[PDB]
Amino acid sequence: FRKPQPFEYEGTDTGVVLLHAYTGSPNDMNFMARALQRSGYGVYVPLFSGHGTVEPLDILTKGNPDIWWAESSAAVAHMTAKYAKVFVFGLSLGGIFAMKALETLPGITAGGVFSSPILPGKHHLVPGFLKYAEYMNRLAGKSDESTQILAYLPGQLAAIDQFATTVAADLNLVKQPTFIGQAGQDELVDGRLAYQLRDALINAARVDFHWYDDAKHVITVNSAHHALEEDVIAFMQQENE
Structure with a gap:
């Protein structure tokens, strides 16, 4: 199995x-990163933490929102x-931290999300996680882990939800221009959340909102990605x- 690595392109x-997706990795951003590189960024x-390994349980046992926020x-x-x-x-997970960065960290010009946050009651991430684990373990010749997954996954989703609600409550703090992109056929999160995010950003200098009509969730990789790249640039x- 090939471990994805963090990566960096130099600019001027x-x-x-x-910031990547839950169960994702830097691979989620390969196309976007390269598009940005071609435009000189x-x-x-x-x-x-916990992502990018051969063991899907590592996500659940070696990562958490506090670690990912520090990262x-x-x-x-x-x-x-x-x-x-x-x-x-x-993306949805990385985007929670992008927004918290705009709210609380210094020196940032602007930022935003390529999908709606992970908020309580507004996601279908459990079947996705189970299918991810099955795909990965099959390819690695590892045994099925559905039972351990069910033991940890609800608790981690709860932790993400909780962290995300605090970020949502602080959206009034955002002064920077904010970008919002959302897949129109999103199978993992309720895309209606994108409108709530837009509406909560009452103090943002501007909100640049984009809907990707026919695309599934991971708009940085699927057919929406050229449009997204153009919009972000x-x-x-x-x-x-």
Whole structure:
């Protein structure tokens, strides 16, 4: 099995932090990162604890929202040390931390999400996780882990939900321009949350909102990805003088 690695592309004036999906990895961001590189942006794609291993239970036993928040914060600092301007974006999980970064961390120009946050009652992540684990374990010749998954998964989703509700309660703190992208056929989260996120950002300088009509959840990888890349780049370019 090939472990995805965190990765970084050097730029000049502007750098971008890309925060991946739950059960995902830096691979979630390969296309986006490369599109940004072609337009001359620096890019940093960390790996969240517990992800990117041969053992799906590692997500549940070696990662948690507090660890992932520290990792996201460290990633932002890494980039704000180097670049005149830094943007931070993420998928559903990574996007919770992107928004908390805009709310609470210094030196960030703008940022946003490529899918709605993970909030209580508004996701279908359990079948996704079970199918992920089955695919991975099959490929690795490992035995089925559904029983242990059910023992830990509800508790971790609860932890994510909880962390996310606090981030949602602080959305009034966001002053930066915010980007919102959401798949229109999202099988993992209720895309209606994107509108609630938009509406809660009462103090944001602007909210740049994009709906990807026919696309499934992971719009950084599926047929929506060229459009998303163009939209994100346009969003960043609006910060030029």
